[PDB]
């Protein structure tokens, strides 16, 4: 059977999310007292805040838009909002320069990924940022973030569009993977391509509390790496390179900014914390691969750098191929990739010149988007919460990114393993966590993620209790679906300004519009 409306042309491509899924969603909105199946934990108070990529136009600029990336769409935000058991929704586009100027225009006008040489005239000397990859609550500021521009703040409440690089930093770039120091509360990062377009230049930065930069330092990577994601540690940042190099004359010639090669080794930056000079920062080593995101790291107590990552043992973006025929060979060759979680020990003791130690296995299974207990961040950690194909339950043909089906739960002290399976024919996304109360263990409380129920065409949250991690509590039920995202966050309600006084919908007057004498009822007939 087919529908005969079905066949009238869209003048869409596909634009697919990191899931493979390919529906634009981009509704703008609320749902106040979301349905929920089960009891939302009066022990949630606070926000998890999602962001995916969603474009919010056709993205035809350029050759049509047949070479959008997965990693493309403009930034869209769903907060999901607990207080006292009620759960409201909230989504809304982040007003990028990009957003605004396509949105203005009814029209595509920017083209590849990371390339303003294939963007439209008028346009390639903006902040080309979707803003689609992380969020963070730094200093009472709420931050969309993507690592080719500083980050856009958002009102917290009504995610209203406030700015652009609200901490001032002098590099072009932000991370999307700063991490919040549990000991200082310094939002600790970097930003490479920290110049513009392939440059070497990273610039690392700590901003304290208050929102002032407190350490700073300019240096440079051995080449022009994708520098995704980084581990923090209490005398450290380590920068984790993934083997792709961008090149400026393939960007010129409309190509990719990235491209993958096989020949190099993933390559670690140590940057002592406050660092004095460039000269302190090391350069260490291992083979070819793709560790995609850390859980975190900390130093151990003979002063070892301890990280555990996802790797995929190849490219895990392959829409970003090799320049070479012979790498694209290689890369067509080897198919799906094997994936695993590990740990990495980079011993400062040693010389950063030899070969790292090949990384220990702890999950021999497909994982991503790992989260960790945020109050140990920077600081000796034991919990992940780790996005998994589930063991014997799942593809294995899949891509990294499109066949994640289950939550893992790794305590390393324990070391225990617990898995949580979204169901057939269903999807999980990255988990976030939220603490029992202030005071309880780490990895005490409830982890929460949105599940895509693919027959069903809808998503929800799952809210589970680390006391059962098999089963979940609660389900936060949407009457749709939205957009497979990318990273998103626990925010505590503590953290939030004016969190006691104000939802992410405004509640209507109190005062009745309508005069006492228009009731249908009087109480004397
Ligand atoms: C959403 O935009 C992105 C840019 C670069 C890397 C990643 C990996 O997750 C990403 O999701
Ligand atoms: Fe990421």
Redesign the pocket.
């Known amino acids: 059977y087919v529908h005969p409306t079905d066949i009238l042309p869209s003048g869409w491509p596909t634009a697919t999310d ?1 899931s493979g899924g390919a529906q634009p969603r981009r509704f703008e909105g609320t749902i106040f007292d979301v349905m929920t199946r089960g009891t939302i934990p009066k022990e949630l108070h606070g926000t998890f805040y999602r ?1 995916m ?1 969603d474009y919010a136009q056709p993205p035809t600029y350029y050759k049509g838009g047949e070479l959008n990336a ?3 769409g403009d ?1 869209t935000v769903a907060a999901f909002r607990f207080k006292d058991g009620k759960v409201d929704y909230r989504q809304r586009f982040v007003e990028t320069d990009r957003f605004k100027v396509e949105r203005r225009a009814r029209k595509s006008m920017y083209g590849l ?1 990371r390339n303003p040489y294939t963007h439209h005239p008028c346009v390639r000397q903006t902040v080309e940022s ?1 803003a ?2 992380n969020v963070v609550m730094h200093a009472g500021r709420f931050l969309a973030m ?3 521009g500083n980050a856009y703040e958002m009102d917290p409440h009504t995610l209203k569009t406030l700015g652009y690089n609200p901490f001032n930093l002098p590099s072009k770039t932000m991370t ?1 993977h700063p991490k919040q120091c549990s000991v200082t509360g310094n939002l600790v990062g970097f930003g490479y391509e920290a110049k513009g377009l392939a440059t070497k230049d990273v610039y690392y930065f700590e901003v304290d509390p208050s929102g002032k930069v407190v350490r700073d330092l300019w240096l440079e990577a051995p080449w022009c790496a ?1 520098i ?1 994601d980084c581990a923090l540690t209490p005398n450290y940042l380590v920068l984790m390179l993934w083997p792709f190099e961008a090149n400026l004359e393939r960007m010129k010639a409309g190509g990719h900014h990235w491209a993958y090669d096989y020949t190099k080794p993933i390559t670690w930056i140590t940057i002592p914390r406050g660092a004095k000079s460039k000269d302190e920062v090391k350069y260490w080593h291992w083979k070819n691969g793709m560790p ?2 850390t859980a975190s790291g900390f130093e151990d107590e003979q002063g070892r750098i301890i990280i555990d990552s996802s790797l995929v043992h190849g490219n895990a ?1 392959p829409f970003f191929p090799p320049d070479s025929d012979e790498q694209k060979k290689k890369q067509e060759a080897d198919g799906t990739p094997k994936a695993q979680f590990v740990r990495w020990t980079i011993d400062p003791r040693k010389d950063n010149n030899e070969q790292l130690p090949d990384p220990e296995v702890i999950l021999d299974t497909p994982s991503e988007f790992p989260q960790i207990d945020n109050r140990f961040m920077g600081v000796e950690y034991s919990s992940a919460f780790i996005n998994v194909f589930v063991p014997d339950r799942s593809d294995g043909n899949k891509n990294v ?1 499109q066949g994640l089906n289950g939550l893992a739960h790794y305590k390393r002290k324990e070391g225990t393993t617990e898995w949580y399976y979204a169901g057939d024919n269903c999807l999980i996304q990255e988990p976030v966590f939220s603490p029992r109360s202030k005071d309880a263990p780490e990895g005490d409380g409830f982890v929460l993620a949105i599940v895509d129920r693919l027959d069903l065409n809808r998503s929800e949250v799952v809210v589970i209790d680390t006391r059962d991690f098999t089963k979940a509590v609660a389900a936060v039920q949407l009457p749709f679906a939205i957009r497979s995202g ?2 998103g966050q626990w925010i505590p309600g503590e953290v939030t300004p004016d969190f006691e006084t104000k939802g992410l919908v405004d509640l209507p007057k109190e005062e009745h519009w309508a005069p006492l004498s228009q009731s249908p009822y009087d109480p004397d007939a």
């Open positions: 990191l962001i990529p997965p990693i493309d930034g990924y979707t689609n990859t993507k690592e080719n999307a994708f995704h995609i995101h973006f990114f990318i990273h």
